[PDB]
Symmetry: D2
Subunit: 212 residues, 4 copies
């Protein structure tokens, strides 16, 4: 029988885009392809407002847009927990929290784009103990992205290369490089982003005067 | 005052995708940017079933999917005329027909991706007299595409370079290279194409057993 | 053991670029990775000057630039035969010629980008019987390109599908979409194309005043 | 008339690739096209071996490969100073050093890809005062890269926005997303990387057994 899996994507989602969404679909299809898993749920967890130097739209707006984006999904949902904490939280702690909730046992895996794996290499960015826990205790499903070589990142990381059974590389056969930064700039300039992000998200953005 | 413009996109739309749709949005924003035009309507005209060697889904299905895709557009519509003719028709004749309908005067311009301009160079593909009429009588709005150099195609074409006032190059700042061929293959394999094409189009495809 | 293979690339090479050369390397590694082939040579065959609607630099120059580009390759050479003929020649005929030239005999395969595979679909472009002879009697090695889906092209063409075993899809996880059209325009504007095409080619272009506005 | 400019590129260059070199050419043409600058030199400065978490080839080798790659450039040279220091050094300090070296004086600007511009946003990575001195006292020339939106990065950073006149966005209408990570993995697998990095670099790599699995 197949192992039940829940995919957790942590990120800014400022705003959520069709690209972030496609990431779940490709990841799910990949895991199902292996024959060993049965993805049962997808979770979008927007980062807290105290994170980073960049000024994101308020967390309640990012959760609301993600929710609207997912109204048309029958397996992916947004979870505000992380954004509703008083402070930013390292991702491994978000995995721990969501794992606990699952026990109130499916496997919880972190879902991310290849650019994320590359940040594992950034000085003082991620704790090595955390990278190890993520791939050893939970699991990692990485979706390809132009200009990134996931296989190489894994091979060159002493930590990742020792936990490949728990790392799944899902290749993106389509060229999808739509930047959220670009989306925000286009909106600020009054230009269309239709067909780049869900219509409901576009409406919400207009209604609430976001990115202007 | 601004010159009223109607954009006509001729193609297979087998099926229509978010990329084909984004093409209209970018083209419209570009023309509006110049300050000289006011795009009043967009028209998707699916090619007839006798065209080419490739086996397309029946024209009534392609029109139906385009219609569903456009239900959420307030300015773009599908026009079945071309696909409802007994035989394939050169594009200039589709422009002539739609121009006549406009008179029962806005400017009618052909909308296409950069790869189209490149086919103008294919031996025995397009009649030179037709390429001239399209750019001289109507106009051409070209949206960028990875691997294509529209400025060079124009400069190297004796015909195009003499009619640049009627050619508008709209640059696509986003990397959007989602192939319809890939979409069809993914669907045939039972894989998701959600977030690549509109949900309503996906539903229609399933309902009518298309691309299987 | 491994069967010998010669790769033939027909195209404009106006001018030959690093991308065109990369195609040969990717294809060879791919064929070797299958374990059944041993690529022994690559051939660059610039198209005749009567070809198409686009003005190409003289074949004399395109052959020269390819030769100079290939001076640093130990397995790929340029062959001017096709360009020296009185007129343009269908690709199947160039394959036939080079096959005879080879005549326990190595297999000659057409090397091309995925885009060319898409052109097989173009009405009145390639004769169906030629596409058939190309994939059946020779073989095709196709290198991936952004925006193209070679697997789908093959599945949607009855001819390609039937002879798919003779079609080798090589994929390069790299994005190398550098068009020769852009190369020519940049050169005409006095901009650099260094590191996009070989230094020897840029030298020849400058020395012979090619691609000037 | 035009003010003289020296371009400084700090990075790993593990190994230097055609893409890294292309960056210099695109940036120079861009600056010249503005009409107010005259690029007189480019400098490749490989990072110190104590840098980061990733294992890099020895700086001795990275400097050597850059020198060999640049033998065919008449304006870009490699400078080992940064890599010869006892430890990693913040980029603003390397700029300060090379500026003093120049000391009616040319302007020294940091040359980088758009991705580096995005790293300015990374928490605890770049000191805000350094980002400020880099864009105000030196200048930044950024080359576009797929998936990045330099214009938005600048608009969203108060510091960058305030000194945007000293940030030059160069765009190359070409897709050249060839990662050095892929280059290293391919080399470790015995695959070709010819036409992705300079022939002289491949020779050095083979001769010194670099990037072996
Ligand atoms: N075109 C595309 N194709 C495929 N994937 C794409 C994509 N665009 C975005 N993505 C993916 O979308 C996801 C979210 O993107 P985005 O909204 O930009 O989110 P982003 O800012 O990239 O997310 C940063 C996340 O990492 C966490 N973090 C950072 C640093 C250290 C630690 C720690 O625990 O020590 C944790 C942080 O708390 C936050 O959850 C990413 O996984 C990205 O790769
Ligand atoms: N990712 C993307 N980014 C930007 N644009 C994109 C795109 N994907 C498709 N497109 C554009 O979508 C449009 C439709 O695409 P697709 O569905 O593939 O349609 P396609 O098969 O490329 O369309 C062929 C059209 O050209 C006409 N034609 C061909 C040859 C000769 C003559 C003549 O009159 O002599 C006429 C033909 O009747 C038909 O209307 C194209 O303009 C394409 O460039
Ligand atoms: N970035 C890139 N990545 C991978 N491959 C890339 C590439 N850029 C070009 N290429 C490849 O380079 C090669 C040469 O490119 P280019 O210089 O543009 O050559 P191109 O003009 O595309 O070559 C046309 C060729 O097809 C032949 N043809 C056409 C139509 C009908 C028939 C017939 O026999 O009926 C024959 C014609 O005789 C000529 O040899 C192509 O195979 C192209 O796919
Ligand atoms: N395809 C492509 N198109 C355009 N540009 C491309 C490229 N591939 C790489 N590049 C560019 O090549 C250059 C070198 O690449 P790579 O070899 O990967 O170098 P990389 O590891 O990205 O360089 C990091 C550099 O940033 C410095 N840094 C980092 C963090 C904090 C601080 C500080 O002072 O606080 C300084 C560090 O000392 C080092 O010099 C980069 O500018 C990159 O953007």
């Amino acid at each position: 029988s197949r192992i039940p899996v829940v995919l957790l994507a942590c990120g800014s989602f400022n705003p959520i885009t069709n690209m972030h969404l496609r990431m779940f679909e490709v990841a799910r299809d990949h895991l199902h392809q292996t024959g060993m898993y049965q993805v049962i749920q997808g979770i979008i967890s927007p980062v807290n407002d105290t994170y980073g130097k960049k000024d994101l739209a308020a967390s309640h707006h990012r959760v609301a847009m993600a929710r609207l984006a997912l109204q048309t999904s029958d397996w992916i949902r947004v979870d505000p927990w992380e954004s509703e904490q008083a402070q930013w939280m390292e991702t491994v702690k978000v995995l721990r929290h969501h794992h606990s909730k699952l026990l109130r046992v499916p496997e919880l895996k972190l879902l991310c784009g290849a650019d994320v794996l590359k940040t594992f290499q950034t000085p003082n960015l991620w704790k090595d103990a955390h990278i190890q826990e993520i791939v050893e205790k939970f699991g990692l499903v990485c979706v390809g992205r132009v200009s990134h070589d996931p296989k190489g990142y894994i091979a060159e990381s002493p930590i990742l290369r020792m936990h490949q059974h728990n790392i799944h590389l899902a290749k993106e056969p389509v060229q999808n490089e739509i930047s959220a930064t670009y989306i925000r700039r286009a909106l600020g300039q009054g230009q269309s982003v239709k067909y780049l992000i869900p219509d409901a998200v576009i409406t919400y953005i207009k209604d609430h005067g976001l990115y202007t």
